[PDB]
Amino acid sequence: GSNNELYLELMKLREHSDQHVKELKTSLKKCARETADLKFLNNQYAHKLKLLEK
Amino acid sequence: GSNNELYLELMKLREHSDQHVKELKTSLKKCARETADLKFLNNQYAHKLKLLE
């Protein structure tokens, strides 16, 4: 083994992580939109259900 | 010495990026949980509506 191999491995790990970060940021934005939509829809549903009672 | 400094700097960069992945992964899990909670309510509402209709 050599420290150069170790250094190179740490560099490879960093680059892989950076790529993962980009993918996660994309997924997060997608999920956030879905939550927003469901929240809006749920508010409509809850209200409609409350009208039928009255 | 400088060998140790190089190791620590490379480890720093490695760990900073990995910690970032951890953060985002946990945030996404949270968002996914929130989505599940809302779908449950959403499905419960919708199902309850179709019956009264």
Short mmCIF file of all heavy atoms in Angstrom, two decimals, chain A residues 6-8 10-11 13-14 17-18 20-21 24-25 27-28 31-32 34-36 38-39 41-42 45-46 48-49 52, chain B residues 3 6-7 10-11 13-14 17-18 20-21 24-25 27-28 31-32 34-35 38-39 41-42 45-46 48-49 52-53:
data_model
loop_
_atom_site.label_atom_id
_atom_site.label_comp_id
_atom_site.label_asym_id
_atom_site.label_seq_id
_atom_site.Cartn_x
_atom_site.Cartn_y
_atom_site.Cartn_z
N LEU A 6 -3.95 6.03 -1.32
CA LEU A 6 -4.91 6.51 -0.34
C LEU A 6 -5.45 7.88 -0.74
O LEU A 6 -6.66 8.10 -0.72
CB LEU A 6 -4.27 6.56 1.04
CG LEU A 6 -5.15 7.03 2.20
CD1 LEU A 6 -6.38 6.14 2.35
CD2 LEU A 6 -4.35 7.05 3.49
N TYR A 7 -4.56 8.79 -1.09
CA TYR A 7 -4.95 10.13 -1.53
C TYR A 7 -5.89 10.05 -2.73
O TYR A 7 -6.94 10.70 -2.76
CB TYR A 7 -3.73 10.97 -1.89
CG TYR A 7 -2.75 11.19 -0.75
CD1 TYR A 7 -1.42 11.48 -1.01
CD2 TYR A 7 -3.15 11.11 0.57
CE1 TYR A 7 -0.52 11.69 0.02
CE2 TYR A 7 -2.26 11.31 1.61
CZ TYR A 7 -0.94 11.60 1.32
OH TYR A 7 -0.05 11.80 2.35
N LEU A 8 -5.50 9.25 -3.72
CA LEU A 8 -6.30 9.11 -4.93
C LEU A 8 -7.68 8.56 -4.62
O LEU A 8 -8.66 8.94 -5.26
CB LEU A 8 -5.57 8.22 -5.94
CG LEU A 8 -4.38 8.89 -6.63
CD1 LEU A 8 -3.49 7.86 -7.31
CD2 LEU A 8 -4.87 9.91 -7.64
N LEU A 10 -9.35 8.99 -1.77
CA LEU A 10 -10.10 10.07 -1.12
C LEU A 10 -10.63 11.05 -2.16
O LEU A 10 -11.72 11.60 -2.02
CB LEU A 10 -9.22 10.80 -0.11
CG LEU A 10 -8.77 10.00 1.11
CD1 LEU A 10 -7.82 10.82 1.96
CD2 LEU A 10 -9.96 9.55 1.93
N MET A 11 -9.85 11.27 -3.21
CA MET A 11 -10.25 12.16 -4.29
C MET A 11 -11.42 11.57 -5.06
O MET A 11 -12.36 12.27 -5.42
CB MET A 11 -9.07 12.43 -5.22
CG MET A 11 -7.97 13.25 -4.57
SD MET A 11 -6.42 13.19 -5.49
CE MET A 11 -6.97 13.71 -7.11
N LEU A 13 -13.61 9.37 -3.91
CA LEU A 13 -14.77 9.39 -3.04
C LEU A 13 -15.46 10.75 -3.08
O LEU A 13 -16.69 10.84 -3.14
CB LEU A 13 -14.37 9.05 -1.60
CG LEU A 13 -13.98 7.59 -1.34
CD1 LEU A 13 -13.25 7.47 -0.01
CD2 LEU A 13 -15.20 6.69 -1.36
N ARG A 14 -14.66 11.82 -3.04
CA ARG A 14 -15.19 13.17 -3.05
C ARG A 14 -15.98 13.43 -4.33
O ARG A 14 -17.07 13.99 -4.30
CB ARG A 14 -14.05 14.19 -2.93
CG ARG A 14 -14.51 15.65 -2.93
CD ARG A 14 -14.46 16.27 -4.32
NE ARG A 14 -14.90 17.66 -4.32
CZ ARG A 14 -14.10 18.71 -4.11
NH1 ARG A 14 -12.81 18.53 -3.88
NH2 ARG A 14 -14.61 19.93 -4.13
N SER A 17 -19.26 11.58 -4.29
CA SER A 17 -20.19 12.24 -3.37
C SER A 17 -20.80 13.47 -4.02
O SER A 17 -22.01 13.70 -3.92
CB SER A 17 -19.47 12.62 -2.07
OG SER A 17 -19.04 11.47 -1.37
N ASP A 18 -19.97 14.27 -4.69
CA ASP A 18 -20.45 15.48 -5.36
C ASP A 18 -21.54 15.15 -6.37
O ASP A 18 -22.52 15.89 -6.50
CB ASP A 18 -19.29 16.20 -6.05
CG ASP A 18 -18.42 16.98 -5.09
OD1 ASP A 18 -18.82 17.14 -3.91
OD2 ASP A 18 -17.34 17.44 -5.50
N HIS A 20 -23.52 12.55 -6.23
CA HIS A 20 -24.68 12.13 -5.46
C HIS A 20 -25.46 13.34 -4.96
O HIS A 20 -26.69 13.34 -4.94
CB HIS A 20 -24.25 11.24 -4.29
CG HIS A 20 -25.34 10.37 -3.76
ND1 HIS A 20 -25.10 9.33 -2.89
CD2 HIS A 20 -26.68 10.38 -3.97
CE1 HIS A 20 -26.24 8.73 -2.58
NE2 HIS A 20 -27.21 9.35 -3.23
N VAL A 21 -24.73 14.37 -4.54
CA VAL A 21 -25.33 15.61 -4.07
C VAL A 21 -26.24 16.21 -5.14
O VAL A 21 -27.36 16.63 -4.86
CB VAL A 21 -24.25 16.63 -3.64
CG1 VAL A 21 -24.83 18.03 -3.47
CG2 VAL A 21 -23.59 16.18 -2.34
N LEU A 24 -29.44 14.21 -5.47
CA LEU A 24 -30.31 14.38 -4.31
C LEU A 24 -31.02 15.73 -4.34
O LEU A 24 -32.19 15.83 -3.98
CB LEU A 24 -29.50 14.24 -3.02
CG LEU A 24 -29.02 12.82 -2.72
CD1 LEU A 24 -27.98 12.83 -1.61
CD2 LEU A 24 -30.19 11.91 -2.34
N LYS A 25 -30.31 16.77 -4.76
CA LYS A 25 -30.90 18.10 -4.87
C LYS A 25 -32.07 18.07 -5.85
O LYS A 25 -33.08 18.73 -5.65
CB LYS A 25 -29.86 19.13 -5.30
CG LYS A 25 -28.90 19.55 -4.20
CD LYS A 25 -27.93 20.62 -4.67
CE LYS A 25 -27.03 21.10 -3.54
NZ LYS A 25 -26.01 22.08 -4.00
N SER A 27 -33.90 15.30 -6.62
CA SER A 27 -34.95 14.52 -5.99
C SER A 27 -35.70 15.36 -4.95
O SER A 27 -36.92 15.27 -4.83
CB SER A 27 -34.37 13.27 -5.32
OG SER A 27 -33.74 12.43 -6.27
N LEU A 28 -34.96 16.17 -4.21
CA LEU A 28 -35.53 16.97 -3.14
C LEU A 28 -36.52 17.99 -3.70
O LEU A 28 -37.61 18.17 -3.15
CB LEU A 28 -34.43 17.68 -2.35
CG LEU A 28 -34.84 18.39 -1.07
CD1 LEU A 28 -35.40 17.41 -0.05
CD2 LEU A 28 -33.66 19.15 -0.48
N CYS A 31 -39.69 16.13 -4.80
CA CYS A 31 -40.51 15.74 -3.66
C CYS A 31 -41.22 16.95 -3.05
O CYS A 31 -42.39 16.87 -2.67
CB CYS A 31 -39.65 15.06 -2.59
SG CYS A 31 -40.60 14.61 -1.12
N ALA A 32 -40.51 18.07 -2.97
CA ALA A 32 -41.06 19.28 -2.38
C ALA A 32 -42.28 19.78 -3.14
O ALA A 32 -43.23 20.28 -2.55
CB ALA A 32 -40.00 20.37 -2.33
N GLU A 34 -44.32 17.83 -4.92
CA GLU A 34 -45.37 16.85 -4.69
C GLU A 34 -46.06 17.09 -3.35
O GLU A 34 -47.28 16.97 -3.24
CB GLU A 34 -44.80 15.43 -4.74
CG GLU A 34 -44.28 15.02 -6.11
CD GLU A 34 -43.67 13.64 -6.12
OE1 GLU A 34 -43.59 13.01 -5.04
OE2 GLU A 34 -43.27 13.17 -7.21
N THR A 35 -45.27 17.42 -2.33
CA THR A 35 -45.81 17.71 -1.01
C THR A 35 -46.70 18.95 -1.06
O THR A 35 -47.78 18.99 -0.46
CB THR A 35 -44.69 17.91 0.03
OG1 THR A 35 -43.98 16.68 0.22
CG2 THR A 35 -45.25 18.37 1.38
N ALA A 36 -46.24 19.97 -1.78
CA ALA A 36 -47.00 21.20 -1.92
C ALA A 36 -48.37 20.92 -2.55
O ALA A 36 -49.39 21.41 -2.08
CB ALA A 36 -46.23 22.21 -2.76
N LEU A 38 -50.07 18.02 -2.75
CA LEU A 38 -50.89 17.21 -1.86
C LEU A 38 -51.49 18.07 -0.75
O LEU A 38 -52.63 17.86 -0.33
CB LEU A 38 -50.07 16.07 -1.26
CG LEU A 38 -49.74 14.92 -2.21
CD1 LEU A 38 -48.64 14.05 -1.64
CD2 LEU A 38 -50.99 14.09 -2.48
N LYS A 39 -50.70 19.02 -0.26
CA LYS A 39 -51.14 19.89 0.83
C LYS A 39 -52.30 20.77 0.36
O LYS A 39 -53.27 20.98 1.09
CB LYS A 39 -49.97 20.75 1.32
CG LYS A 39 -50.19 21.37 2.69
CD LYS A 39 -48.93 22.05 3.21
CE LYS A 39 -47.80 21.07 3.43
NZ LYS A 39 -46.65 21.67 4.16
N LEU A 41 -54.31 20.12 -2.25
CA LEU A 41 -55.44 19.25 -2.54
C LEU A 41 -56.15 18.82 -1.26
O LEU A 41 -57.38 18.80 -1.20
CB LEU A 41 -54.96 18.02 -3.32
CG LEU A 41 -56.03 17.05 -3.84
CD1 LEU A 41 -57.03 17.77 -4.75
CD2 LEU A 41 -55.38 15.90 -4.58
N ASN A 42 -55.38 18.48 -0.24
CA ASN A 42 -55.94 18.06 1.04
C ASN A 42 -56.79 19.16 1.66
O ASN A 42 -57.83 18.89 2.27
CB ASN A 42 -54.84 17.64 2.01
CG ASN A 42 -54.38 16.21 1.79
OD1 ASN A 42 -54.87 15.51 0.90
ND2 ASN A 42 -53.42 15.76 2.60
N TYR A 45 -60.09 19.15 -0.15
CA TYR A 45 -60.85 17.98 0.26
C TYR A 45 -61.45 18.16 1.65
O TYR A 45 -62.64 17.92 1.86
CB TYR A 45 -59.97 16.73 0.25
CG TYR A 45 -59.68 16.16 -1.13
CD1 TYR A 45 -60.17 16.75 -2.28
CD2 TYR A 45 -58.91 15.01 -1.26
CE1 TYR A 45 -59.91 16.22 -3.53
CE2 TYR A 45 -58.64 14.47 -2.51
CZ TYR A 45 -59.14 15.08 -3.64
OH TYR A 45 -58.87 14.55 -4.88
N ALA A 46 -60.62 18.58 2.60
CA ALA A 46 -61.06 18.76 3.98
C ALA A 46 -62.24 19.72 4.03
O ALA A 46 -63.20 19.51 4.77
CB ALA A 46 -59.92 19.27 4.84
N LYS A 48 -64.35 20.55 1.45
CA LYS A 48 -65.51 19.98 0.77
C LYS A 48 -66.25 19.01 1.68
O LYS A 48 -67.48 18.99 1.71
CB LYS A 48 -65.08 19.27 -0.52
CG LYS A 48 -66.24 18.79 -1.37
CD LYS A 48 -65.76 18.21 -2.69
CE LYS A 48 -66.92 17.74 -3.54
NZ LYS A 48 -66.47 17.18 -4.85
N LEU A 49 -65.49 18.22 2.44
CA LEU A 49 -66.08 17.29 3.39
C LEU A 49 -66.81 18.03 4.50
O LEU A 49 -67.80 17.54 5.04
CB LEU A 49 -64.99 16.39 4.00
CG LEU A 49 -64.50 15.24 3.12
CD1 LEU A 49 -63.22 14.65 3.68
CD2 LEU A 49 -65.58 14.17 3.00
N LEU A 52 -70.38 19.33 3.27
CA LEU A 52 -71.42 18.30 3.22
C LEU A 52 -72.05 18.11 4.59
O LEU A 52 -73.24 17.81 4.70
CB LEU A 52 -70.83 16.99 2.71
CG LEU A 52 -70.26 17.03 1.29
CD1 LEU A 52 -69.51 15.75 0.97
CD2 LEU A 52 -71.36 17.27 0.27
N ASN B 3 2.95 16.07 4.48
CA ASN B 3 2.29 14.83 4.09
C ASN B 3 0.99 14.68 4.87
O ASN B 3 -0.06 14.38 4.30
CB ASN B 3 3.19 13.61 4.33
CG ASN B 3 4.46 13.65 3.51
OD1 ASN B 3 4.44 13.43 2.30
ND2 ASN B 3 5.58 13.92 4.17
N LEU B 6 -1.58 17.30 3.73
CA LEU B 6 -2.24 16.90 2.49
C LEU B 6 -3.32 15.87 2.77
O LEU B 6 -4.43 15.96 2.25
CB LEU B 6 -1.22 16.35 1.49
CG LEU B 6 -1.79 15.78 0.19
CD1 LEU B 6 -2.60 16.82 -0.56
CD2 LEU B 6 -0.67 15.23 -0.68
N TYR B 7 -3.00 14.89 3.61
CA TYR B 7 -3.96 13.86 3.99
C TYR B 7 -5.19 14.48 4.65
O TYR B 7 -6.32 14.15 4.31
CB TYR B 7 -3.31 12.85 4.94
CG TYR B 7 -4.26 11.82 5.51
CD1 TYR B 7 -4.84 10.86 4.69
CD2 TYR B 7 -4.57 11.81 6.86
CE1 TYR B 7 -5.72 9.92 5.21
CE2 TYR B 7 -5.44 10.87 7.38
CZ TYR B 7 -6.01 9.93 6.55
OH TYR B 7 -6.88 8.99 7.07
N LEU B 10 -7.37 16.45 2.13
CA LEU B 10 -8.12 15.56 1.25
C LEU B 10 -9.23 14.87 2.02
O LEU B 10 -10.32 14.65 1.48
CB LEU B 10 -7.19 14.52 0.61
CG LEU B 10 -6.29 15.05 -0.51
CD1 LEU B 10 -5.27 13.99 -0.93
CD2 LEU B 10 -7.11 15.49 -1.71
N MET B 11 -8.97 14.53 3.28
CA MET B 11 -9.99 13.93 4.12
C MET B 11 -11.10 14.94 4.37
O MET B 11 -12.28 14.59 4.36
CB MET B 11 -9.39 13.45 5.44
CG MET B 11 -10.39 12.73 6.34
SD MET B 11 -11.14 11.30 5.54
CE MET B 11 -9.72 10.22 5.41
N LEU B 13 -12.11 17.38 2.44
CA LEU B 13 -12.94 17.51 1.25
C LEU B 13 -13.84 16.30 1.10
O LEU B 13 -15.02 16.44 0.77
CB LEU B 13 -12.06 17.69 0.01
CG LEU B 13 -11.22 18.97 -0.01
CD1 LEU B 13 -10.17 18.91 -1.11
CD2 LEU B 13 -12.11 20.19 -0.20
N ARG B 14 -13.29 15.12 1.35
CA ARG B 14 -14.06 13.89 1.29
C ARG B 14 -15.21 13.95 2.29
O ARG B 14 -16.36 13.67 1.94
CB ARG B 14 -13.15 12.68 1.59
CG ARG B 14 -13.83 11.31 1.54
CD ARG B 14 -14.62 11.01 2.80
NE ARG B 14 -14.81 9.58 3.02
CZ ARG B 14 -15.77 8.85 2.46
NH1 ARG B 14 -16.64 9.40 1.62
NH2 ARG B 14 -15.86 7.55 2.74
N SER B 17 -18.15 16.59 1.63
CA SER B 17 -19.07 16.18 0.58
C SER B 17 -19.97 15.04 1.05
O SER B 17 -21.17 15.01 0.76
CB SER B 17 -18.30 15.75 -0.67
OG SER B 17 -17.35 14.74 -0.36
N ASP B 18 -19.40 14.10 1.80
CA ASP B 18 -20.15 12.97 2.32
C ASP B 18 -21.19 13.44 3.33
O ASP B 18 -22.31 12.93 3.38
CB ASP B 18 -19.22 11.94 2.96
CG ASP B 18 -19.95 10.68 3.39
OD1 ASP B 18 -20.74 10.15 2.59
OD2 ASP B 18 -19.74 10.23 4.53
N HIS B 20 -22.58 16.26 3.28
CA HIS B 20 -23.59 16.94 2.49
C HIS B 20 -24.60 15.93 1.95
O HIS B 20 -25.81 16.19 1.96
CB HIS B 20 -22.93 17.71 1.33
CG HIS B 20 -23.82 18.74 0.71
ND1 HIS B 20 -25.04 19.10 1.24
CD2 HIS B 20 -23.65 19.51 -0.39
CE1 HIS B 20 -25.59 20.03 0.49
NE2 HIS B 20 -24.77 20.30 -0.51
N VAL B 21 -24.11 14.79 1.49
CA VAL B 21 -24.97 13.70 1.03
C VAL B 21 -25.87 13.25 2.17
O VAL B 21 -27.07 13.06 1.99
CB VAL B 21 -24.13 12.53 0.48
CG1 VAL B 21 -25.01 11.30 0.23
CG2 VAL B 21 -23.42 12.94 -0.80
N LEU B 24 -28.70 15.84 2.80
CA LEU B 24 -29.72 15.81 1.76
C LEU B 24 -30.52 14.51 1.80
O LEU B 24 -31.74 14.52 1.59
CB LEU B 24 -29.08 15.99 0.38
CG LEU B 24 -28.41 17.34 0.14
CD1 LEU B 24 -27.66 17.33 -1.18
CD2 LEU B 24 -29.42 18.48 0.17
N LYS B 25 -29.85 13.39 2.05
CA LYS B 25 -30.53 12.11 2.16
C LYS B 25 -31.58 12.16 3.27
O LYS B 25 -32.70 11.67 3.11
CB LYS B 25 -29.54 10.98 2.45
CG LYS B 25 -28.92 10.35 1.22
CD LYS B 25 -28.15 9.09 1.60
CE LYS B 25 -27.41 8.50 0.42
NZ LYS B 25 -26.63 7.29 0.79
N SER B 27 -32.94 14.86 4.54
CA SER B 27 -33.97 15.83 4.16
C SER B 27 -34.97 15.20 3.20
O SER B 27 -36.17 15.47 3.28
CB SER B 27 -33.33 17.06 3.51
OG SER B 27 -32.55 17.79 4.44
N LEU B 28 -34.48 14.37 2.29
CA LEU B 28 -35.33 13.70 1.32
C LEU B 28 -36.23 12.68 2.01
O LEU B 28 -37.41 12.57 1.69
CB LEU B 28 -34.49 13.03 0.23
CG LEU B 28 -35.26 12.37 -0.92
CD1 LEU B 28 -36.09 13.39 -1.69
CD2 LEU B 28 -34.30 11.66 -1.85
N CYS B 31 -38.95 14.55 3.59
CA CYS B 31 -39.92 14.98 2.60
C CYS B 31 -40.79 13.80 2.15
O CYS B 31 -41.99 13.95 1.94
CB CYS B 31 -39.22 15.61 1.39
SG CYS B 31 -40.39 16.20 0.13
N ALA B 32 -40.17 12.63 2.02
CA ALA B 32 -40.90 11.43 1.61
C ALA B 32 -41.91 11.03 2.69
O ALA B 32 -43.01 10.57 2.39
CB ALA B 32 -39.94 10.29 1.32
N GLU B 34 -43.34 13.12 4.79
CA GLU B 34 -44.39 14.12 4.73
C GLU B 34 -45.36 13.81 3.60
O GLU B 34 -46.57 13.99 3.73
CB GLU B 34 -43.79 15.52 4.56
CG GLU B 34 -42.99 15.99 5.76
CD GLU B 34 -42.28 17.30 5.52
OE1 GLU B 34 -42.18 17.72 4.35
OE2 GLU B 34 -41.81 17.91 6.51
N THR B 35 -44.81 13.32 2.49
CA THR B 35 -45.63 12.93 1.34
C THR B 35 -46.53 11.76 1.71
O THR B 35 -47.71 11.74 1.35
CB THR B 35 -44.75 12.55 0.13
OG1 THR B 35 -43.99 13.68 -0.28
CG2 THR B 35 -45.61 12.07 -1.03
N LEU B 38 -49.39 12.86 3.90
CA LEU B 38 -50.39 13.61 3.15
C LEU B 38 -51.21 12.70 2.25
O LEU B 38 -52.42 12.88 2.11
CB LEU B 38 -49.72 14.71 2.32
CG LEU B 38 -49.20 15.92 3.10
CD1 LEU B 38 -48.38 16.82 2.19
CD2 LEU B 38 -50.35 16.71 3.72
N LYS B 39 -50.56 11.72 1.63
CA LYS B 39 -51.27 10.75 0.80
C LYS B 39 -52.29 9.98 1.63
O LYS B 39 -53.41 9.74 1.18
CB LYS B 39 -50.30 9.79 0.13
CG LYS B 39 -49.56 10.37 -1.05
CD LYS B 39 -48.57 9.37 -1.63
CE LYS B 39 -47.88 9.92 -2.86
NZ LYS B 39 -46.87 8.97 -3.39
N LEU B 41 -53.86 10.95 4.33
CA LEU B 41 -54.98 11.85 4.56
C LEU B 41 -55.75 12.07 3.26
O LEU B 41 -56.98 12.06 3.25
CB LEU B 41 -54.50 13.19 5.12
CG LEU B 41 -53.86 13.15 6.50
CD1 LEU B 41 -53.23 14.49 6.84
CD2 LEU B 41 -54.88 12.76 7.56
N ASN B 42 -55.02 12.26 2.17
CA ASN B 42 -55.62 12.50 0.87
C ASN B 42 -56.52 11.34 0.46
O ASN B 42 -57.65 11.55 0.02
CB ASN B 42 -54.53 12.72 -0.18
CG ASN B 42 -55.09 13.23 -1.50
OD1 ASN B 42 -55.17 12.50 -2.48
ND2 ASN B 42 -55.49 14.50 -1.51
N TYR B 45 -59.61 11.21 2.75
CA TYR B 45 -60.58 12.22 2.33
C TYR B 45 -61.33 11.76 1.08
O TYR B 45 -62.55 11.67 1.08
CB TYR B 45 -59.88 13.55 2.05
CG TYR B 45 -59.34 14.27 3.27
CD1 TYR B 45 -58.17 15.01 3.20
CD2 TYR B 45 -60.00 14.21 4.49
CE1 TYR B 45 -57.67 15.67 4.30
CE2 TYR B 45 -59.51 14.87 5.60
CZ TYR B 45 -58.34 15.60 5.50
OH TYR B 45 -57.85 16.25 6.60
N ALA B 46 -60.57 11.50 0.02
CA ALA B 46 -61.15 11.13 -1.27
C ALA B 46 -62.11 9.96 -1.13
O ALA B 46 -63.22 9.98 -1.68
CB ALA B 46 -60.05 10.80 -2.26
N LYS B 48 -63.67 9.02 1.53
CA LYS B 48 -64.81 9.45 2.34
C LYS B 48 -65.77 10.30 1.51
O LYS B 48 -66.97 10.33 1.77
CB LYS B 48 -64.33 10.24 3.56
CG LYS B 48 -65.33 10.29 4.70
CD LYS B 48 -65.41 8.95 5.43
CE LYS B 48 -66.32 9.03 6.64
NZ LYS B 48 -66.35 7.75 7.40
N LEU B 49 -65.23 10.99 0.50
CA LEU B 49 -66.03 11.84 -0.37
C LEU B 49 -66.89 11.01 -1.32
O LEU B 49 -68.10 11.22 -1.42
CB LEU B 49 -65.14 12.78 -1.17
CG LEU B 49 -64.61 14.02 -0.43
CD1 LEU B 49 -63.49 14.67 -1.22
CD2 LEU B 49 -65.73 15.01 -0.19
N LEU B 52 -70.23 9.74 0.07
CA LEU B 52 -71.30 10.72 0.27
C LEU B 52 -71.87 11.18 -1.07
O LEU B 52 -73.06 11.50 -1.17
CB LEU B 52 -70.78 11.92 1.06
CG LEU B 52 -70.22 11.61 2.45
CD1 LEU B 52 -69.64 12.87 3.08
CD2 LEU B 52 -71.28 11.00 3.36
N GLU B 53 -71.02 11.22 -2.10
CA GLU B 53 -71.45 11.62 -3.43
C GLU B 53 -72.52 10.68 -3.96
O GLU B 53 -72.24 9.80 -4.78
CB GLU B 53 -70.26 11.66 -4.39
CG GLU B 53 -69.23 12.73 -4.05
CD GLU B 53 -67.97 12.61 -4.89
OE1 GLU B 53 -67.96 11.80 -5.83
OE2 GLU B 53 -67.00 13.34 -4.61
#
